[PDB]
Design a protein around this nucleic acid. Sequence first.
DNA 1: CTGGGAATTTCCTGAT
DNA 2: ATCAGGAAATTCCCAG
Lengths: 73, 73
Amino acid sequence: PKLCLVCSDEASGCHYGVLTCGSCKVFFKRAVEGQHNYLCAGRNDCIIDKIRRKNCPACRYRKCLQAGMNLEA
Amino acid sequence: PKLCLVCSDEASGCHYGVLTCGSCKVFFKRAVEGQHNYLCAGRNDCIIDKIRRKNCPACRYRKCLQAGMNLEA
DNA sequence: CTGGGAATTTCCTGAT
DNA sequence: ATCAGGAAATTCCCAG
Ligand SMILES: [Zn+2]
Ligand SMILES: [Zn+2]
Ligand SMILES: [Zn+2]
Ligand SMILES: [Zn+2]
């Protein structure tokens, strides 16, 4: 396997239970330790990839959870 | 008793031809000045308000133009 | 070798 | 024209 399950960018390994890129790894860590205030300006279907992942942390965090990312993994 | 024509936040006056808040004023200036290629992660229909205006500069910039904001005014 | 996490840098936004 | 808070992504060091 390769290709991070969140943003489809090249994956650096298995992080918090899921194959992800380095950027999504630290994003999830930040989001989960913080209070995740995030609001989607769209329909919560936003495209998350290398280009657009910065746009919507709401949808990015959702895709992190849906992929099964968790801290104790 | 009047609001920014872009994000609906309290308007500070008439900026670049349109009633806007200070934040949308400097955003627009920076956007035109700034080479920026913006990409919406959504449908280009994004909700732009006080909180969500940070999410999508693409739709924010579009709303600036649609409202009639221009450096010539 | 693996992955967690701190540190660092850069960028965006908004106020002064 | 600064300046500061925040988010983002890389670099680096840690334990295993
Ligand atoms: Zn990713
Ligand atoms: Zn979204
Ligand atoms: Zn505004
Ligand atoms: Zn948008």
